[PDB]
Enzyme design. Structure first.
Site, short mmCIF file in Angstrom:
data_model
loop_
_atom_site.label_atom_id
_atom_site.label_comp_id
_atom_site.label_asym_id
_atom_site.label_seq_id
_atom_site.Cartn_x
_atom_site.Cartn_y
_atom_site.Cartn_z
N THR B 15 0.15 2.87 17.86
CA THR B 15 0.11 2.74 19.31
C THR B 15 -1.32 2.74 19.82
O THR B 15 -1.67 1.94 20.68
CB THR B 15 0.91 3.86 20.00
N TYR B 16 -2.15 3.65 19.31
CA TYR B 16 -3.57 3.68 19.66
C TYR B 16 -4.39 4.13 18.45
O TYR B 16 -3.86 4.79 17.54
CB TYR B 16 -3.85 4.60 20.86
N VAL B 19 -5.45 4.50 11.72
CA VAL B 19 -5.17 5.53 10.72
C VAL B 19 -5.87 5.23 9.39
O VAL B 19 -5.95 4.07 8.97
CB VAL B 19 -3.66 5.71 10.51
N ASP B 87 5.93 3.88 4.55
CA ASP B 87 6.89 3.85 5.64
C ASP B 87 8.21 3.26 5.18
O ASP B 87 8.25 2.49 4.20
CB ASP B 87 6.36 3.12 6.88
N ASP B 128 10.23 5.41 20.36
CA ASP B 128 9.74 4.30 19.54
C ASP B 128 10.17 4.43 18.09
O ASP B 128 9.43 4.06 17.18
CB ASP B 128 8.21 4.18 19.63
N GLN B 132 8.89 1.25 10.72
CA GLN B 132 7.43 1.36 10.70
C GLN B 132 6.94 2.79 11.05
O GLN B 132 5.94 3.24 10.50
CB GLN B 132 6.82 0.34 11.67
N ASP B 146 4.03 8.78 14.69
CA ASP B 146 3.54 8.09 15.90
C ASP B 146 4.29 8.48 17.19
O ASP B 146 5.20 7.77 17.62
CB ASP B 146 3.48 6.57 15.70
O1 LIG Z 1 3.68 1.52 3.88
S1 LIG Z 1 2.27 1.75 3.63
O2 LIG Z 1 2.09 1.68 2.21
C1 LIG Z 1 1.29 0.62 4.37
C2 LIG Z 1 2.11 -0.57 4.83
N1 LIG Z 1 2.58 -0.41 6.20
C3 LIG Z 1 2.58 -1.56 7.10
C4 LIG Z 1 3.93 -1.74 7.80
C5 LIG Z 1 5.01 -2.29 6.87
O3 LIG Z 1 5.29 -1.34 5.83
C6 LIG Z 1 1.93 3.22 4.17
C7 LIG Z 1 1.78 3.49 5.53
C8 LIG Z 1 1.51 4.78 5.98
C9 LIG Z 1 1.38 5.83 5.07
N2 LIG Z 1 1.11 7.11 5.41
C10 LIG Z 1 0.92 7.62 6.65
N3 LIG Z 1 0.98 6.81 7.73
C11 LIG Z 1 0.78 7.26 8.98
O4 LIG Z 1 0.85 6.41 10.05
C12 LIG Z 1 0.27 5.12 9.99
C13 LIG Z 1 1.36 4.14 10.44
C14 LIG Z 1 2.18 4.74 11.60
C15 LIG Z 1 2.46 3.87 12.84
C16 LIG Z 1 2.27 2.38 12.59
C17 LIG Z 1 0.88 2.15 12.02
C18 LIG Z 1 0.76 2.73 10.61
C19 LIG Z 1 0.51 8.69 9.18
N4 LIG Z 1 0.28 9.49 10.23
C20 LIG Z 1 0.10 10.73 9.73
N5 LIG Z 1 0.21 10.76 8.37
C21 LIG Z 1 0.46 9.52 7.96
N6 LIG Z 1 0.67 8.94 6.76
C22 LIG Z 1 1.53 5.55 3.72
C23 LIG Z 1 1.80 4.26 3.27
#
Ligand SMILES: O=S(=O)(CCNCCCO)c1ccc(Nc2nc(OCC3CCCCC3)c3nc[nH]c3n2)cc1
Lengths: 262, 299
Positions: B15-16, B19, B87, B128, B132, B146
Site C-alpha cells: 500500500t505504501y 518492503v 505469500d 484488503d 497477496q 499489510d
Molecule cells: O512471495 S514472495 O516470494 C515474493 C513474490 N510476491 C509477489 C506477489 C505474488 O506472489 C514473498 C513475499 C513476501 C515475503 N515475506 C514478507 N512479506 C511482507 O510483505 C510484503 C508484501 C505484502 C503486501 C504486498 C507487497 C509485498 C512482510 N511484511 C512483514 N513481514 C513480511 N514478510 C516472502 C516471500
C-alpha cells in the site's frame, strides 16, 4: 444487525475499558507546567472546536486531538507561545487517523493565522508522534457514548445530541474533568442527558454492561451538572454555539434541570 | 540505528513504502523492513503509516504479522516486522499441478479466521484481504499482513471510505454503495479466498464494478428483497439488473465436500447481517478434524 457488531460489541467494550486506563493523561500535569494554565488550555480546546466546525470534522477527531494534547503535555513542558502549535499538530494527526478526507497541512498552517510555518507544524507532528510513540488509537467519550445509545428504548435524537454536548463541554475544563475516565464521563453525560429530556434514569441494562451505578457516577455527575448550569456564563462559548445547529437538534438551547434528585 | 541491519533483497511494494528482506547482524533474526521516504514538503507522515503503526502495536496474535520496532529518522521512517517466507498467491501458483492438500486449506482457513476475529474483537477492519496480503512460513503458519488500508471502527459503525477492498474481493454491500459497512466485508474476502484455495483461480475476477456485481450475481443469483431485505433501496441498485437464477451451490466449487460447501455458503451470504462472523465460523463442523501441518512444498 452487523452495523452494531452483535458478535464483538462486548469484547470491544472490554478492550476499550482496558485501553482507557493505559491511555489516561496524568491528572496533576498542569501544576507541573511552568508557563501554561488551565485557562490557557481552555482557550486552545475551544479554538480546536472552531476548527472542527470550520472544516466539518467528525466529533471523534476533536476528542482524539485533545487526548493527544493532554498526553503530550503530561510529559512535555511548553511555553505559552507554542501551545497552539502542539494543538495544531495534534488536530492534524487526529484527522489523519479518523477522517476520510482530512484537511491538508497547508490548511492547518492557514487557521493558525500565519503564527507558525509549515516547517514547524510538520516537525511538531513528528515530535507528538515520538512522545506518544505512535499510540493514537485511543478510547474517547464518544466511543463509549455511542454504545450507551444502543440501550434507550426507543432511540431519542435529543438525548443522543445532548449527551455528546455534555461530553464535549467536559473537554474544555481540565479541573475537574482530567480525573474522570472517558467511560465514566460518557455515563454521567448519558444519564444527565436522558434525565433532562425524558425524566428517565441510567438503566439497569447499562449497569449490567458497565458495572457503574448512579452511586459510582455521582461525583462526576455532580461536576457535570454544575458545568451544564454555568455554561451560558463560561468564558469559552464555541461548543454552545456549535450545538445550536439543527445538525445536533439545537440541544444547547434546552434547560438544564434545577436538581438531579439523587 | 539501521546500523545492525544488512539488506538481502527487495521483496515488493504494498500500500505504501517498500518492503525488504534484511537480517539483524547481532541476533541473526531475519526481518522485513517497510521503508517510507518522508521528503517532508509533501504532507508529513502519511495516514496509511499512522494507521498501520498504531493498530499493529496493539494487535498481537500468532496470525497477525508482528510489528517488532519502528525506527524514526528525521526524513525516513523504518518499520521492522517479523519475516515470512512467501505469500499465499505464489504458493497457489506453486501448487499448479497437485493442488493444495485439503488439510492445508483447512488449517489455513482456520488460522485466517482466528487472526480476523482478533482484529474484529479489537475494533479493527482490515479492508484488503487477498492472497497477496496473506503470508506463510515453513512451519505451517499463515498470517494477515499489510494493514495499510485498515481502520479502527466505532460501535455502531459510521460511514467510512468507499474506495475499499481490492475489486475481486469486494463485498456486494460496498459495490452497491451502501452508506454503512462492517466486519462482514472482511468475511466476504476470506470467503473468496477459501474458494480460491480450492480451485486456484479467483472466484469473481471482474474488470469493473458492474462486471464484478454481475459475476457475483450469475453465481449466487441476483438478490431480491426475500434473500436480502432492503437491496432494491440501495444507492447503486438498479431495477434493470438482469435477474439470474442461483446456482446449485455444489457447482460453485465442485471438489468441495458438504461441510466445506456449508461454510462457504455462509461466508458468501448476500445480507451482511446474516453472514457468518469470524468468531462463529471457528466452530463449524468443517474444522472438526483440523490440524496444522507444514506446507507440502519447499518455499
Ligand atoms: O512471495 S514472495 O516470494 C515474493 C513474490 N510476491 C509477489 C506477489 C505474488 O506472489 C514473498 C513475499 C513476501 C515475503 N515475506 C514478507 N512479506 C511482507 O510483505 C510484503 C508484501 C505484502 C503486501 C504486498 C507487497 C509485498 C512482510 N511484511 C512483514 N513481514 C513480511 N514478510 C516472502 C516471500
Amino acid at each position: 444487525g452487523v452495523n452494531e457488531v452483535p458478535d464483538y460489541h462486548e469484547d470491544i467494550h472490554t478492550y476499550l475499558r482496558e485501553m482507557e486506563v493505559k491511555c489516561k493523561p496524568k491528572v496533576g500535569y498542569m501544576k507541573k507546567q511552568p508557563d501554561i494554565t488551565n485557562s490557557m488550555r481552555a482557550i486552545l480546546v475551544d479554538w480546536l472546536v472552531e476548527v472542527g466546525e470550520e472544516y466539518k470534522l467528525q466529533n471523534e477527531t476533536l476528542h482524539l486531538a485533545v487526548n493527544y494534547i493532554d498526553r503530550f503535555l503530561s510529559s512535555m513542558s511548553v511555553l505559552r507561545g507554542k501551545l497552539q502549535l502542539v494543538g495544531t499538530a495534534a488536530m492534524l494527526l487526529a484527522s489523519k487517523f479518523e477522517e476520510i478526507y482530512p484537511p491538508e497541512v497547508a490548511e492547518f498552517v492557514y487557521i493558525t493565522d500565519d503564527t507558525y510555518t509549515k516547517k514547524q507544524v510538520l516537525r511538531m507532528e513528528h515530535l507528538v508522534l515520538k512522545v506518544l510513540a505512535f499510540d493514537l488509537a485511543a478510547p474517547t467519550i464518544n466511543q463509549f457514548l455511542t454504545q450507551y445509545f444502543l440501550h434507550q428504548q426507543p432511540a431519542n435524537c435529543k438525548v443522543e445530541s445532548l449527551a455528546m454536548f455534555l461530553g464535549e463541554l467536559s473537554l474544555i475544563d481540565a479541573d475537574p474533568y482530567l480525573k474522570y475516565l472517558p467511560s465514566v464521563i460518557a455515563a454521567a453525560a448519558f444519564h444527565l442527558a436522558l434525565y433532562t429530556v425524558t425524566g428517565q434514569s441510567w438503566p439497569e441494562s447499562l449497569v449490567q454492561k458497565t458495572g457503574y451505578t448512579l452511586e459510582t457516577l455521582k461525583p462526576c455527575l455532580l461536576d457535570l451538572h454544575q458545568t451544564y448550569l454555568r455554561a451560558p456564563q463560561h468564558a469559552q462559548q464555541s461548543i454552545r454555539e456549535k450545538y445550536k445547529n439543527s445538525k445536533y437538534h439545537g440541544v444547547s438551547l434546552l434547560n438544564p434541570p434545577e436538581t438531579l434528585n439523587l | 540505528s539501521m546500523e545492525n541491519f544488512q539488506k538481502v533483497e527487495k521483496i515488493g511494494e504494498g500500500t505504501y513504502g517498500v518492503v525488504y528482506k534484511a537480517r539483524n547482524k547481532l541476533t541473526g533474526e531475519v526481518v522485513a523492513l517497510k521503508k517510507i521516504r518522508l521528503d517532508t514538503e509533501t504532507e508529513g507522515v502519511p495516514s496509511t503509516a499512522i494507521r498501520e503503526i498504531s493498530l499493529l502495536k496493539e494487535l498481537n496474535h500468532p496470525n497477525i504479522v508482528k510489528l517488532l520496532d519502528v525506527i524514526h529518522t528525521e526524513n525516513k521512517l523504518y518499520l521492522v516486522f517479523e519475516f515470512l517466507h512467501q505469500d499465499l498467491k505464489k504458493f497457489m501458483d506453486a501448487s499448479a499441478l497437485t493442488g493444495i492438500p485439503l488439510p492445508l486449506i483447512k488449517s489455513y482457513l482456520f488460522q485466517l479466521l482466528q487472526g480476523l476475529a482478533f482484529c474484529h474483537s479489537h475494533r479493527v477492519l482490515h479492508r484488503d484481504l487477498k492472497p497477496q496480503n496473506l503470508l506463510i512460513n515453513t512451519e505451517g503458519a499463515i498470517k494477515l499482513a499489510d494493514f495499510g488500508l485498515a481502520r479502527a471502527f466505532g460501535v455502531p459503525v459510521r460511514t467510512y471510505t468507499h474506495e475499499v477492498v481490492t475489486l475481486w474481493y469486494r463485498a456486494p454491500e460496498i459495490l452497491l454503495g451502501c452508506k454503512y459497512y462492517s466486519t462482514a466485508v472482511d468475511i466476504w474476502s476470506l470467503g473468496c479466498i477459501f474458494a480460491e484455495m480450492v480451485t486456484r483461480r479467483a472466484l469473481f475476477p471482474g474488470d469493473s464494478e458492474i462486471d464484478q456485481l454481475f459475476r457475483i450475481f450469475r453465481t449466487l443469483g441476483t438478490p431480491d428483497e426475500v434473500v436480502w431485505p432492503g437491496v432494491t433501496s440501495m444507492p447503486d441498485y438498479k431495477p434493470s439488473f438482469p435477474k439470474w437464477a442461483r446456482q446449485d451451490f455444489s457447482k460453485v466449487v465442485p471438489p468441495l465436500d458438504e461441510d466445506g460447501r456449508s461454510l462457504l455458503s455462509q461466508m458468501l451470504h448476500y445480507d451482511p447481517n446474516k453472514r457468518i462472523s469470524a468468531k462463529a465460523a471457528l466452530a463449524h463442523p468443517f474444522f472438526q478434524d483440523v490440524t496444522k501441518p507444514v506446507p507440502h512444498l519447499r518455499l
